[PDB]
Design a protein around this motif. Structure first.
Motif, PDB file in Angstrom:
ATOM      1  N   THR A  14       0.807  -1.203   0.000  1.00 16.82           N
ATOM      2  CA  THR A  14       0.000   0.000   0.000  1.00 16.82           C
ATOM      3  C   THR A  14       0.843   1.257   0.000  1.00 16.82           C
ATOM      4  O   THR A  14       0.475   2.251  -0.620  1.00 16.82           O
ATOM      5  N   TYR A  15       1.991   1.234   0.719  1.00 19.07           N
ATOM      6  CA  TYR A  15       2.878   2.365   0.826  1.00 19.07           C
ATOM      7  C   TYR A  15       3.856   2.461  -0.328  1.00 19.07           C
ATOM      8  O   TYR A  15       4.605   3.434  -0.407  1.00 19.07           O
ATOM      9  N   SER A  16       3.924   1.438  -1.224  1.00 16.66           N
ATOM     10  CA  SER A  16       4.766   1.494  -2.407  1.00 16.66           C
ATOM     11  C   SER A  16       4.035   2.132  -3.562  1.00 16.66           C
ATOM     12  O   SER A  16       4.661   2.500  -4.555  1.00 16.66           O
ATOM     13  N   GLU A  17       2.695   2.323  -3.434  1.00 21.59           N
ATOM     14  CA  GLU A  17       1.908   3.201  -4.276  1.00 21.59           C
ATOM     15  C   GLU A  17       2.430   4.618  -4.214  1.00 21.59           C
ATOM     16  O   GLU A  17       2.622   5.265  -5.242  1.00 21.59           O
ATOM     17  N   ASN A  18       2.711   5.092  -2.971  1.00 25.26           N
ATOM     18  CA  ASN A  18       3.283   6.384  -2.652  1.00 25.26           C
ATOM     19  C   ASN A  18       4.680   6.503  -3.211  1.00 25.26           C
ATOM     20  O   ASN A  18       5.092   7.578  -3.642  1.00 25.26           O
ATOM     21  N   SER A  42      -1.100  -9.929  -0.108  1.00 24.13           N
ATOM     22  CA  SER A  42      -0.750  -8.894  -1.052  1.00 24.13           C
ATOM     23  C   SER A  42      -0.889  -9.492  -2.414  1.00 24.13           C
ATOM     24  O   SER A  42      -0.518 -10.642  -2.635  1.00 24.13           O
ATOM     25  N   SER A  84       5.655  -1.401  -9.813  1.00 24.46           N
ATOM     26  CA  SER A  84       6.494  -0.225  -9.855  1.00 24.46           C
ATOM     27  C   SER A  84       7.421  -0.197  -8.662  1.00 24.46           C
ATOM     28  O   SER A  84       8.522   0.348  -8.741  1.00 24.46           O
ATOM     29  N   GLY A  85       7.032  -0.915  -7.582  1.00 23.61           N
ATOM     30  CA  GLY A  85       7.771  -1.036  -6.353  1.00 23.61           C
ATOM     31  C   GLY A  85       8.962  -1.928  -6.570  1.00 23.61           C
ATOM     32  O   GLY A  85      10.033  -1.682  -6.020  1.00 23.61           O
ATOM     33  N   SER A 141      -0.559  -2.653 -10.958  1.00 25.91           N
ATOM     34  CA  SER A 141       0.261  -1.462 -11.009  1.00 25.91           C
ATOM     35  C   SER A 141       0.293  -0.729  -9.689  1.00 25.91           C
ATOM     36  O   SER A 141      -0.111   0.430  -9.601  1.00 25.91           O
ATOM     37  N   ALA A 142       0.816  -1.387  -8.631  1.00 22.59           N
ATOM     38  CA  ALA A 142       0.948  -0.786  -7.332  1.00 22.59           C
ATOM     39  C   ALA A 142       2.103  -1.452  -6.644  1.00 22.59           C
ATOM     40  O   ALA A 142       2.722  -0.847  -5.769  1.00 22.59           O
TER      41      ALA A 142
END
Lengths: 49, 906, 71, 71
Positions: B125-129, B182, B191-192, B187-188
Motif C-alpha cells: 500500500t505504501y509502495s503506491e506512494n 498482497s 512499480s515497487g 500497477s501498485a
C-alpha cells in the motif's frame, strides 16, 4: 549472493545423493559376490577361531 | 540511556530512548482527539523521522520494543488507518519500523509469525506512494550503525520474494492466499519491484534474481538488460558487468528445465551483444547451439565495414575456434560475397590454418618413439596400431610406414585397422594420402576398406573452403555396391566433417540408412555415422534414423551386436538438443516391446539432460528391478533381456556425464564417485551387470572432466586386473591423458605392471598394450578433452566415437573403430597480420581463487611461464594474458579457452 | 506366559497343550488360535531358537492341523 | 485355516526407504520443478480426467464411518 549460490548448488546435491546411494549400497555390495566372498569368509572363520 | 529531560538536544535523544514524548503521548492523544491537529502532525512527521535516525545508533532490543509499543497498537486500535484517510497513510513511515522491531529485534514466536503478514500488506500500500522505496533505501545505503538494520532491511525485501514464489506453487495466487495478503501483480507493486531492483543492484546483488526466477519469465530478464546496459562502462567497467551476466545463465543453469533455460540464455546473449565486447557474445551464442545466434555476431563485424580492416580478420577467428565445424560452414560464403580477399579469409575460417600452427608447436615437442617391437601372431597386430596411437595429430613418421614389411604381415580384420592406423599419423593433415593410395589399388579388398577409414581421419583438418573435402573422395566408394567398401566410406565421411551438416554431406547420407531388411552386421555404420554428423548443433531428430531402427527390430534379432549399436546411435543423434527429445521418447514408446524398452532409457537421458535429478533416481530404480522381482519368487528371451540390462547401465552413466559438464561447477568431484558406487551395488545385484559397468566407469570420468585424476583411476584399476575384460584399462586411459606426463605416468607404470606381468592370452594382452600408448603424447604435443575447451561447460562432437565404444565385449571388429579417436585442442599463439607463431608470455593458474567465479576469471597474479607452451589441462586450466607490461591488448579474451590469442600492439 | 517361560522344557509342553485344547477350533470362535499358530511357525522358521524350542514348535503345529482338520 | 507366506516384503521395505530419503536430498531441484509443471496441468487436464485437482483430492468432508461390516 547469487554467485555464492552457483557453487552451493553443485555441492549440496551431488554429495548428498552419493550419501543416500552408499547407505542403500551397504547391502548391495554383498549381493553380486556371495559365493566367492562368503565362501572365503567361511574358510577364514573356520581356521582362526 | 537514562532520562535526563530537555536540558540540551543531546539529552532529548536519551529521553526518547526510554519513553518518547514527541512520538508516543503527544501524537497518540493528538490523533485521537482533534482533527484540526492533523496539520500539526504533518509538520511533526519530519521531527519524528530525525529521532529514529539519531537513535538508529542504539541497538538494544528493550529500548526500541517498549518505546514504540503503543504506536504499534495505534494502527488498528485508535487510528484504525482511516480516521483521516491520506494522513495515516503518509504517517505509515515511522510506524513501519515499529512493526519490524517485534519481527526481528525481539523474538516472541507468536508475534513474529503474525506481523510478517501485516508487514506485507502495508509494504504494498505504501509502495503506491513510492516512499516505501525510500524507506528501504535509507537502510540499504545506511546512515548509522546497529546490528538490527543489517537483518531488518531484508525482512521488508523478503515479503516480495515470498508472494512471487507462492503464485507458481499454488495456482490460486494473489491476495487470496493469507500468507502475504498482497496481490501478485497490478500497477501498485510492480512499480515497487522495479525501483527496489535499481537500489539493490548498485549496493547489493540480491533481490534482482529472486524476482526473475519467481516470475519464471524471460520478460523479467529483458527488463534487466535495460538498466545494466547503461551501467556498462560509466558506473563500473565492462568486466564487472560481465561477471553478473555469464553468471545470469550459470547460477540457475542447473534449475531451468529445457523451455525455460533456453529462453533465459537468449537474454544473456543479447546483453553481451549490446555491450562493448563481442568476445562475450560469441561464447554464449555457441552455448545455445542455435544457428541464428552464431550468424548475428559474425554479421555484426563483417557486413557494416566495407574495408577489410580488423573486422574481417576478427570474424574469421571467432568462427574458426569451434572444431565441430558448425560455425565454419555458416560463416563461409559471406567472405566470398563481400570479396575483399578470398584467399586469406576462407583459409583462416577453415581448420587449414590450424594445421600450420601445429608445425610450430611440433618443433619444440620433437619426436620420441617408444612403440612396441613385438612381431608375429596377434602381437604384430598390436604393435602396428600402437605406432599410430603414439603419433596422433600431425606427426612425421613416413619412413617407418614406407617399410611395407610389417604392414603386409597384418591379416584379416587386422589389415583394415592397420591401414586405418597409418591415417592417424597424418591426422589433421593434407599430406598423407599417398601412403594410403598404394595399398588401395592392389591386393585383396581388405586393404581397400582400411584405406577409406584412414582418409576419414586425415580429412579432419581439411574439409572447408572446398579444398580437398572428404565428400569428394568418398562419394565414389558409396556408389560401389560392396558392403565393406561402402560402410567404411560413410564412417570416414562422418568423422571428417564432424558436426558440419553441409548440403552435399548431409544429403548423401539422406536416402541411405534405410535398409536393414538384409542382414548385415557391419551396417551399424549406416546409422552410426549419421548420428555423429548430427551432434554439435540442434537436431531435427531425423525421420530416416527413427524409421530404420524399427525396421531392423522387425527383420532380425539374431545379430545381437547389430541391434545394440543401433540403440546407442539414436541416443547419440539426439545430443545437441533436449527440448525436442522429450517428444520423441513418447513416439518410440508408442510401439511397445521389452526390446523397445531398452532404447527408451537411453533417450530419457538426453531429454532430461541439464535437468537430471528425476533422471538420476530413475536410472537406479531400473537397476534394482530384475533382482527385486526375483525377490517376489524367493519368499528369444536371451536377446531381449541382455539388451535391456546393458542399455540401463550405459544410460545411468550418460545421464550423469552430460549433467556434470553444463551445471554450476563444484560438484564434479562427486559425480565420479556416484559411478564407483554404481559399480559397488554391482561389486556382491547383477553378475552379468558388472561386466558392463567396469567399461562405463572410464568414459564417465573423461566426459565428466573430474578434478581428481591422481587417486581414483589408479585405485579402481588394481581391482579390475582380477576382473575379466581388459577393455576396462582402455576407458581409464582416455581420462588419464590430461596434460601429458602429470597424471598419465602413474597410468603407464600401473597399466604396464598388469600387462607385462601377466600373459595368459595374447587376446587379453592386446587391449592393455593399446591403452598405454594412447595415454601419452610426447612432450605435451596435444591434449584430449571431451569438452570443447572454448566452453568448459561444453561438450565436443569428435569425441563421441570414443564414448560409443565401451558398451560391448571386446572384439577384433571393434579394434577397427578404436583407431579413430579425434578430439584435438590447439595451442594458443599471439597472432599478427603476418600471422606470428609465437606467444610472448602467459600466466598459468592451477586453482582459481575467485569466489566471484566457478569457471574462474583468471587471477591477475598467476605464476609466469615462457613462450609457446601448450594450454595446460587440469591444474593449469585458468590462463591469464601477460602482455600488458610489454603493452599489448588482447582483442580476444582468453580464460583458458581453446581459442588462439590475438593481440594488438599500437 | 508358559510359551515364553525361562526354561525350555516348559515351552514344549505348553505349545502342545494349547494345540490339544484348541485342536480344530476356528479363529472366529477363538481369535487366539491364529496367533498361537503363528508363534509356532515363527519358532520353526527361526534358526536362533534352541533345539528344545524347535522340537516343541513342530510337534505342536501338527496337533493343531491334526486329522485333516476333521478330528 | 490357513497358509502363511511372505518374505518379498523385506525387499520391498528396502526400496521404499530409499526413494523417501532421496527426495529430501533432491528438494532443492524439485521446488523449481513445481513452478513449471502446475500451469501446464491447469490449462489442459490432470492426465485424462478433469477431476482431482479441484482441491487436494476432490473432497474435504468426513470419511470416518463406524459400525460397519458384521457384528
Amino acid at each position: 549472493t547469487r554467485c555464492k549460490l552457483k557453487l552451493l548448488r553443485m555441492e549440496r546435491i551431488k554429495d548428498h545423493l552419493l550419501l543416500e546411494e552408499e547407505f542403500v549400497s551397504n547391502s548391495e555390495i554383498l549381493k553380486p559376490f556371495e559365493k566367492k566372498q562368503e565362501e572365503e569368509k567361511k574358510q577364514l572363520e573356520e581356521i582362526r577361531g | 540511556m537514562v532520562d535526563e529531560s530537555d536540558k540540551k538536544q543531546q539529552t532529548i535523544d536519551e529521553q526518547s530512548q526510554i519513553s518518547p514524548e514527541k512520538q508516543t503521548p503527544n501524537k497518540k492523544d493528538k490523533k485521537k482527539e482533534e482533527e484540526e491537529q492533523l496539520s500539526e502532525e504533518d509538520a511533526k512527521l519530519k521531527t519524528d523521522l530525525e529521532l529514529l535516525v539519531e537513535r538508529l545508533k542504539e541497538d538494544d532490543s528493550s529500548l526500541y520494543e517498549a518505546s514504540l509499543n503503543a504506536l504499534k497498537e495505534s494502527i488498528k486500535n485508535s487510528t484504525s488507518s482511516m480516521t483521516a484517510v491520506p494522513k495515516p497513510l503518509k504517517f505509515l513511515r515511522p510506524t513501519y519500523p515499529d512493526l519490524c522491531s517485534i519481527y526481528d529485534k525481539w523474538t516472541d514466536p507468536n508475534l513474529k509469525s503474525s506481523l510478517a503478514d501485516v508487514l506485507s500488506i502495508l509494504a504494498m500500500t505504501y509502495s503506491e506512494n513510492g516512499k516505501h522505496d525510500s524507506l528501504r533505501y535509507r537502510l540499504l545505503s545506511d546512515v548509522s550503525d546497529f546490528e538490527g538494520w543489517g537483518h531488518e532491511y531484508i525482512r521488508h525485501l523478503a515479503l516480495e520474494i515470498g508472494e512471487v514464489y507462492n503464485d507458481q506453487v499454488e495456482k490460486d495466487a494473489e491476495d487470496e492466499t493469507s500468507s502475504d495478503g498482497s496481490k501478485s501483480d497490478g500497477s501498485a507493486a510492480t512499480s515497487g519491484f522495479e525501483f527496489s531492483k535499481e537500489d539493490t543492484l548498485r549496493l547489493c546483488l540480491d533481490i534482482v534474481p529472486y524476482f526473475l526466477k519467481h516470475n519464471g519469465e524471460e520478460d523479467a530478464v529483458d527488463l534487466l538488460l535495460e538498466i545494466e546496459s547503461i551501467d556498462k562502462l560509466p558506473q563500473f567497467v565492462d568486466e564487472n558487468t560481465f561477471q553478473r551476466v555469464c553468471q545470469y545463465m550459470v547460477a540457475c543453469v542447473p534449475l531451468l528445465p529445457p523451455p525455460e533455460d533456453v529462453a533465459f540464455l537468449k537474454t544473456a546473449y543479447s546483453i553481451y551483444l549490446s555491450q562493448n565486447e563481442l568476445t562475450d557474445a560469441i561464447a554464449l551464442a555457441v552455448r545455445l547451439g542455435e544457428e541464428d545466434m552464431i550468424r548475428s555476431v559474425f554479421d555484426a563485424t563483417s557486413d557494416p565495414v566495407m574495408h577489410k580492416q580488423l573486422a574481417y580478420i576478427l570474424a574469421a577467428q571467432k568462427t574458426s575456434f569451434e572444431y565441430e565445424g558448425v560455425q565454419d560452414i555458416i560463416g563461409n560464403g559471406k567472405l566470398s560475397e563481400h570479396f575483399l580477399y578470398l584467399a586469406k579469409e576462407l583459409n583462416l575460417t577453415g581448420p587449414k590454418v590450424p594445421e600450420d600452427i601445429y608445425k610450430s608447436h611440433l618443433d619444440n615437442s620433437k619426436s620420441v618413439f617408444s612403440s612396441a617391437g613385438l612381431d608375429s601372431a596377434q602381437q604384430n597386430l598390436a604393435s602396428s596400431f600402437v605406432n599410430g596411437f603414439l603419433n596422433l595429430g600431425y606427426c612425421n613418421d613416413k619412413l617407418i610406414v614406407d617399410n611395407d614389411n610389417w604392414v603386409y604381415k597384418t591379416k584379416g580384420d587386422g589389415m583394415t585397422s592397420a591401414v586405418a592406423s597409418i591415417g592417424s599419423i597424418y591426422q589433421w593433415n593434407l599430406d598423407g594420402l599417398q601412403q594410403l593410395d598404394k595399398y588401395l589399388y592392389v591386393d585383396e579388398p581388405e586393404v581397400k576398406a582400411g584405406a577409406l577409414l584412414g582418409i576419414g581421419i586425415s580429412a579432419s583438418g581439411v574439409h572447408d573452403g572446398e579444398v580437398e573435402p572428404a565428400l569428394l573422395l568418398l562419394q565414389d566408394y558409396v556408389t560401389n555396391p560392396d558392403t565393406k567398401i561402402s560402410s567404411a566410406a560413410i564412417l570416414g565421411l562422418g568423422i571428417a566433417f564432424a558436426g558440419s551438416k553441409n548440403d552435399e554431406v548431409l544429403g548423401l547420407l539422406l536416402p541411405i540408412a534405410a535398409s536393414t531388411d538384409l542382414p548385415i552386421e557391419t551396417a551399424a555404420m549406416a546409422s552410426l555415422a549419421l548420428a555423429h554428423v548430427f551432434v554439435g548443433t540442434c537436431n531435427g531428430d531425423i525421420t530416416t534414423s527413427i524409421m530404420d531402427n524399427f525396421l531392423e527390430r522387425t527383420a532380425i534379432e539374431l545379430k545381437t551386436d547389430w541391434v545394440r549399436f543401433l540403440a546407442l546411435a539414436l541416443g547419440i543423434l539426439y545430443m545437441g538438443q533436449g527440448e525436442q527429445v522429450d517428444d520423441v521418447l513418447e513416439t518410440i514408446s508408442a510401439i511397445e516391446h521389452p526390446m523397445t524398452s531398452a532404447i527408451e532409457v537411453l533417450v530419457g537421458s538426453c531429454a532430461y539432460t541439464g535437468t537430471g535429478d528425476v533422471l538420476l533416481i530413475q536410472d537406479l530404480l531400473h537397476r534394482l528391478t530384475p533382482k527385486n522381482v526375483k525377490g517376489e519368487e524367493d519368499a528369444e528371451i536371451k536377446s531381449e533381456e541382455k539388451k535391456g540390462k546393458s542399455s540401463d547401465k550405459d544410460a545411468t552413466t550418460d545421464g550423469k556425464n552430460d549433467d556434470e559438464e553444463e551445471e554450476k561447477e563444484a560438484g564434479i568431484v562427486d559425480e565420479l564417485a556416484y559411478a564407483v558406487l554404481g559399480i559397488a551395488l554391482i561389486a556382491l545385484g547383477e553378475d552379468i551387470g558388472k561386466e558392463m559397468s567396469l567399461r562405463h566407469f572410464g568414459h564417465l570420468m573423461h566426459y565428466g572432466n573430474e578434478h581428481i585424476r591422481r587417486m581414483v583411476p589408479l585405485a579402481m584399476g588394481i581391482v579390475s586386473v582380477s576382473d575379466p575384460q581388459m577393455k576396462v584399462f582402455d576407458t581409464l586411459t582416455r581420462f588419464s591423458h590430461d596434460a601429458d606426463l602429470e597424471v598419465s605416468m602413474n597410468s603407464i607404470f600401473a597399466m604396464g605392471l598388469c600387462g607385462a606381468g601377466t600373459n595368459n592370452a595374447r587376446l587379453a594382452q592386446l587391449l592393455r598394450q593399446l591403452a598405454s600408448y594412447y595415454s601419452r603424447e610426447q612432450d605435451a604435443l596435444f591434449i584430449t578433452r571431451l569438452a570443447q575447451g572454448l566452453l568448459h561447460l561444453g561438450k565436443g562432437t569428435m569425441t563421441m566415437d570414443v564414448f560409443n565404444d565401451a558398451h560391448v565385449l571386446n572384439k577384433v571388429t571393434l579394434a577397427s573403430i578404436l583407431t579413430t579417436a579425434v578430439g584435438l585442442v590447439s595451442p594458443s599463439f599471439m597472432l599478427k597480420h603476418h600471422q606470428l607463431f609465437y606467444m610472448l608470455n602467459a600466466g598459468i593458474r592451477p586453482k582459481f581463487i575467485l569466489a566471484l567465479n566457478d569457471e574462474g576469471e583468471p587471477i591477475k597474479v598467476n605464476v609466469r611461464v615462457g613462450q609457446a607452451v601448450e594450454t595446460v589441462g587440469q591444474a593449469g586450466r585458468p590462463k591469464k594474458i601477460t602482455g600488458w607490461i610489454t603493452q599489448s591488448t588482447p582483442v580476444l579474451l582468453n580464460h583458458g579457452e581453446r581459442a588462439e590469442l590475438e593481440t594488438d600492439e599500437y | 506366559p508358559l510359551t515364553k517361560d525361562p526354561v525350555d522344557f516348559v515351552r514344549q509342553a505348553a505349545m502342545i497343550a494349547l494345540s490339544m485344547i484348541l485342536i480344530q477350533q476356528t479363529e472366529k470362535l477363538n481369535p487366539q488360535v491364529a496367533d498361537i499358530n503363528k508363534n509356532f511357525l515363527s519358532v520353526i522358521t527361526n534358526k536362533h531358537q534352541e533345539g528344545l524350542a524347535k522340537f516343541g514348535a513342530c510337534v505342536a503345529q501338527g496337533i493343531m492341523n491334526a486329522g485333516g482338520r476333521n478330528v | 485355516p490357513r497358509m502363511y507366506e511372505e518374505a518379498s516384503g523385506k525387499e520391498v521395505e528396502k526400496v521404499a526407504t530409499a526413494v523417501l530419503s532421496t527426495t529430501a536430498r533432491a528438494k532443492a531441484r524439485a521446488k523449481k520443478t513445481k513452478k513449471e509443471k502446475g500451469p501446464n496441468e491447469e490449462e489442459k487436464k490432470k492426465e485424462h480426467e478433469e477431476k482431482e485437482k479441484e482441491r487436494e483430492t476432490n473432497k474435504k468432508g468426513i470419511k470416518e464411518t463406524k459400525e460397519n461390516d458384521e457384528e
